[PDB]
Amino acid sequence: KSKLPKPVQDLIKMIFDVESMKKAMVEYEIDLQKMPLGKLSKRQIQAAYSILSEVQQAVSQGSSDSQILDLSNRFYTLIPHDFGMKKPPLLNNADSVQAKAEMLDNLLDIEVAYSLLRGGSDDSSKDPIDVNYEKLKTDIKVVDRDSEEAEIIRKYVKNTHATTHNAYDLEVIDIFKIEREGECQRYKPFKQLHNRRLLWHGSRTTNFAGILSQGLRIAPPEAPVTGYMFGKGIYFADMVSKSANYCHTSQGDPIGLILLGEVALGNMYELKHASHISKLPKGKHSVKGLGKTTPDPSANISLDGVDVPLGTGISSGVNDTSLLYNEYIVYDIAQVNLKYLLKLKFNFKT
């Protein structure tokens, strides 16, 4: 039996759960009889992204529903959806492209998790929890509840839950300190950059095996840049509830995972509205989507030289913006250094 702390063992069990991967695919309307977990591949996912880009091109060029039908059908041929003997819904607009791009991002992480489970060795004498932990190539430790870092993290959670996200509240179950192998070395050129912030990144539990083993990634070249508000980058928030919404937890599945990453923001390119970019203008290191609300700048504190915007939400003074809250985007994977992973219990009031 494993000598790992019980919370670390529970975390490993959660992220490598095959039935959870299947459930996530069902939620996305994928036909598991036609496309089981074992049949997913990088090649097929990449081909589906490319077709989504074909659809995006027809969408921008104002193509008719009859003109788009073949392109829409090509997507379904590659990624079978649960529709029986019926005609599937038409992928004829920007919202459809965005939704399918999000689904493919998830499939890409699920394929990584499944490939780790299938591509190793079998030894019944070892605890499968230890075996699966080693596949993550990440040092995972439990943060002591009475420590300074635990106090700062709990305050960040307590203070940045938006009033507009009040259908639920959050309870921190466990706080883990994480160290992905080689990430500290990769981060070296950015470790002393100005404007380094400790920010939230929420994702479905089924993505975490992929995130821990490969780090946060940018959508592939084949992915449509218009499927993402600020293009193909890595997205973060300074409001815990804004990232917690991306966990996609429910009354029937109320436990979620959220990351705290040190993000080297540097010179921010400030935007109020969608800008589908792949590269930043010269001199810029990140995009800041300007929210109507921001954590109070006077309440910013420092945790190991990194700024933690844990103030309660106040008016930013930014007018006529598409964003209720701030968002931060980097376009180089080396600008992120993952620091903590929190296991959260979502208490739904609805």
Author numbering: 662 to 1011
Sentences from the paper on this structure:
Upon solving the apo structure, we observed weakly defined electron density in the nicotinamide pocket, which was attributed to a molecule of DMSO from the cryoprotection process during crystal freezing. In addition, several of the helices of the HD are slightly differently arranged, resulting in small differences between their relative orientations and positions between the two structures; this is particularly marked for helix E, the helix most distant from the ART domain. Differences within the ART subdomain between the DNA-bound and apo- structures are much smaller than those in the HD, but there is a very localised difference involving residues Pro885 - Tyr889 that come close to helix D of the HD subdomain. In the HD subdomain, the residues that show the clearest indication of local flexibility are Asp678 (between helices A and B), Gly723–Ser725 (between helices D and E), Phe744–Lys748 (which form part of the linker between helices E and F) and Gly779–Asp788 (which form the linker to the ART subdomain).
Poly(ADP-ribose) polymerase 1 (PARP-1) is a highly abundant, chromatin-associated protein that is a key early responder to genomic stress in eukaryotes. A key component in transmission of the allosteric signal is the HD subdomain of CAT, which alone bridges between the assembled DNA-binding domains and the active site in the ART subdomain of CAT. Here we present a study of isolated CAT domain from human PARP-1, using NMR-based dynamics experiments to analyse WT apo-protein as well as a set of inhibitor complexes (with veliparib, olaparib, talazoparib and EB-47) and point mutants (L713F, L765A and L765F), together with new crystal structures of the free CAT domain and inhibitor complexes.
